[PDB]
A paper describes a structure:
On the other hand, [name]-L (CD275) belongs to the B7 family and is expressed on the surface of APCs5,7,8 and non-hematopoietic cells under inflammatory conditions. Binding of [name]-L to [name] triggers distinct intracellular signaling cascades through the conserved motifs YMFM13, IProx14, and KKKY15 in the [name] cytoplasmic tail. These signaling pathways deliver the co-stimulatory signals that promote T cell activation and differentiation.
We determined the molecular basis for the co-stimulatory signal provided by [name] by solving the three-dimensional structure formed by the extracellular domains of [name] (residues 21–129) and its ligand [name]-L (residues 19–248) at 3.3 Å resolution by x-ray crystallography. Truncation of [name] at residue 129 and therefore before C136, abolished the formation of disulfide-linked homodimers and was required to obtain well-diffracting crystals. The crystal structure reveals that [name] adopts the predicted single immunoglobulin (Ig) variable (V-type) domain architecture. [name]-L is organized in two distinct domains: the most apical domain (D1) adopts a V-type fold, whereas the membrane-proximal domain (D2) adopts a C1-type fold. [name]/[name]-L interact in a 1:1 receptor-ligand stoichiometry. The main binding interface is formed by the FDPPPFK motif (amino acids 114–120) located in the [name] FG loop, which interacts with residues from strands C and C’ and loops CC’ and C’D of [name]-L. These residues form a network of interactions that include H-bonds and aromatic stacking (top). Clear electron density was observed in the co-complex crystal structure for two N-acetyl glucosamine (GlcNAc) and three mannose residues of the N-linked glycan at position N110. Unexpectedly, [name]-L residues F122, Q123, and E124 form H-bonds with this [name] glycan, which buries ~300 Å2 of surface area on [name]-L (bottom). In the CTLA-4/B7 and PD1/PD-L1 complexes, the receptors cross the IgV domains of their cognate ligands at ~110° and 90°, respectively. However, in the [name]/[name]-L complex, the IgV domains cross at 150°. A unique feature of [name], however, is its unusually long strand C’ that protrudes from the surface of the ectodomain leading to the formation of a ligand interaction not yet observed in any of the previously solved CD28/B7 family complexes.
Residue numbers in the entry:
A (entry chain C): 19 to 149, 153 to 230
B (entry chain N): 1 to 118
C (entry chain A): 30 to 128
Write the structure that this text describes.
């Protein structure tokens, strides 16, 4: 009885994924086993075992960021509270609820896809030249992969993508950096600029030469 | 999401003879961005980056979208466990932080290979 | 993964010694031949419930069942449903054999 849910969130922002039983009625914490884990990676986000309170098998990533509220558990609301979301937290999170009284049959299973996003730095341009000239546009720390576009600022038209070499880097924080070089022919009065696009965020950053 | 599987899971080899460890970046990953190879020594339970080239020879097929490492002239203490880290058509600054990214849609280290040389 | 003695067959199914609460089911022909379920209780007690008991001897790294019914005719694959409840993550693994 999986309920496909979608939760979009931002990095460093505390988000709440929900695993809700329709009944406002109560549950038995000494009977039920609760598991929050990723669908593919199967990494332990958090869990509830009847007779112990010390999550030692919680994964290093989620060691202290995944919290289930117990009073809400008894009320039937197994909702996870995720803190300080990181780019590696975009996963299909699976909440699974087994009742020992029914021979470990599943009473609740909900798959909550989590999308996360981040904002790139404002692009930085320069004008170094060679034989024709070259431009360098650098923007960093955004999620997911950025779309970079170059604009003929004089008339606000879009230059062809074959004029640019892009190399996106993985920041050690999971965020992305990008360096884009554009080689065009020499001309006076060539107002152009750079553009960083986060399609998930719907936000475009432009900077003139 | 995207991850990387590596073979073999466990191998025992003879001293001096080369050993090969493969790795593939499973679909629907587009292409290999950069490859890293890590090994950890028996006791300290911490990994270290294997410097490519020389004794450790790497072969990469972008068409096959898979990479392989070869060890020559195996000292008896070349044993341990070996991971390989790949990335989905993007590049990384340092290998030091590749395995530190789990479930990232653009980075995954291998399952590991256990090696004992006699 | 199993042996034949005493006009019967001992089918042993292994599991990681880490798991401390689990449910081991033996399946052949799609049918549940044997069953065992281990649980850790309060006050450091262990509960074992078995809806179909096959003289299961519970080694700490594997569970073995004994079928004194041979069923040598129509020899099928033998699967071992393994559900891991403790410790997380919860996973179900099927390992199979022949004869
Ligand atoms: C190895 O052992 C594990 C032990 O857990 C098995 O996994 C179990 O498999 C059974 C059967 O597939 C699962 O039981 C099913 O649970 C479903 C949950 O959905 C509802 O369940 C409750 C009860 O009413 C509702 O309150 C709740 O809101 C959910 O909406 C049920 O829907 C299933 O019933 C339906 O299917 C059965 C067939 O099984 C039909 O006969 C019924 O008429 C009905 O249509 C069923 O109860 C159980 O949840 C699983 N447990 C776990 C932990 O995953 C493995 O299956 C076994 N090995 C293999 C190979 O299967
Ligand atoms: C972004 O896009 C804009 C257009 O939207 C481009 O700007 C135009 O670029 C063209 C081509 O480089 C320019 O055409 C050239 O104009 C020069 C003089 O400009 C003035 O000329 C007329 C009067 O003669 C004025 O009305 C006009 O407003 C301009 O102020 C000429 O000297 C050039 O001559 C060269 O070409 C001709 C024909 O090819 C040859 O006969 C000559 O020998 C010489 O080789 C040429 O005609 C146009 O003027 C530009 N206009 C503006 C407003 O910029 C940008 O170049 C483009 N930028 C990028 C980065 O893509
Ligand atoms: C969240 O974690 C990051 C590093 O993971 C840290 O820089 C930051 O201070 C933490 N807290 C907040 C509120 O961002
Ligand atoms: C409680 O008991 C054991 C030993 O501490 C451990 O394996 C188990 O995961 C613990 N769980 C919780 C939720 O404290
Ligand atoms: C530009 O990028 C391409 C790949 O798109 C690469 O082959 C090439 O080495 C880069 N540099 C130049 C100068 O083309
Ligand atoms: C961002 O810029 C690109 C390139 O011009 C454009 O195709 C896209 O629609 C823009 N989106 C927004 C929200 O500005
Ligand atoms: C991120 O980029 C936006 C829009 O592209 C811009 O206004 C600002 O620099 C940042 N702030 C947001 C999240 O509003
Ligand atoms: C439990 O099994 C392990 C192997 O996983 C073994 O080393 C140990 O002796 C066993 N302990 C018992 C049976 O108490």
């Amino acid at each position: 009885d999986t309920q496909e849910k979608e939760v979009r969130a931002m990095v460093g922002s505390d988000v709440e994924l929900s695993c809700a039983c329709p009944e406002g009625s109560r549950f038995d914490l000494n009977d039920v086993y609760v598991y929050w884990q990723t669908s593919e990676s199967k990494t332990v986000v958090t869990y509830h075992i009847p007779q112990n309170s010390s999550l030692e098998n919680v994964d290093s990533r989620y060691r202290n960021r995944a919290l289930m509220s117990p009073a809400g558990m008894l009320r039937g609301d197994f909702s996870l509270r995720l803190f300080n979301v990181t780019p590696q937290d975009e996963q299909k999170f699976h909440c699974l609820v087994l009742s020992q009284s029914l021979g470990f049959q599943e009473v609740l299973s909900v798959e909550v896809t989590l999308h996360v996003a981040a904002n790139f730095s404002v692009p930085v341009v320069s004008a170094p030249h060679s034989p024709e000239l070259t431009f360098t546009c650098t923007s960093i720390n955004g999620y997911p992969r950025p779309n970079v576009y170059w604009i003929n600022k004089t008339d606000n038209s879009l230059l062809d993508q074959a004029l640019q070499n892009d190399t996106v880097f993985l920041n050690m924080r999971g965020l992305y950096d990008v360096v884009s070089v554009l080689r065009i022919a020499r001309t006076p009065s060539v107002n152009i600029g750079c553009c960083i696009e986060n399609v998930l965020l719907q936000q475009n950053l432009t900077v003139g030469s | 999401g995207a991850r990387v599987d590596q073979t073999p899971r466990s191998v025992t080899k003879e001293t001096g003879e080369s050993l090969t460890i493969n790795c593939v970046l499973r679909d629907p990953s587009y292409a290999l961005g950069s490859t890293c190879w890590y090994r950890k020594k028996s006791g300290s339970t911490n990994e270290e980056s294997i410097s490519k080239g020389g004794r450790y020879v790497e072969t990469v097929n972008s068409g096959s979208k898979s990479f392989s490492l070869r060890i020559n002239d195996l000292t008896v203490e070349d044993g341990g466990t070996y991971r390989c880290g790949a990335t989905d058509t993007v590049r990384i600054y340092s290998c030091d932080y590749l395995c530190a990214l789990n479930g990232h849609r653009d980075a995954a280290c291998g399952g590991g290979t256990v090696v004992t040389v006699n | 993964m199993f042996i034949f003695h005493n006009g019967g067959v001992q089918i042993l199914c292994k599991y990681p010694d880490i798991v401390q609460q689990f449910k081991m089911q033996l399946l052949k022909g799609g049918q549940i031949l044997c069953d065992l379920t281990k649980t850790k209780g309060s006050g450091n007690t262990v509960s074992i419930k078995s809806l179909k008991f096959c003289h299961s001897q519970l080694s700490n790294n594997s569970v073995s069942f004994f079928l004194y019914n041979l069923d040598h005719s129509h020899a099928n694959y033998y699967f071992c449903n393994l559900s891991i409840f403790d410790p997380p993550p919860f996973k179900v693994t099927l390992t199979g054999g022949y004869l």
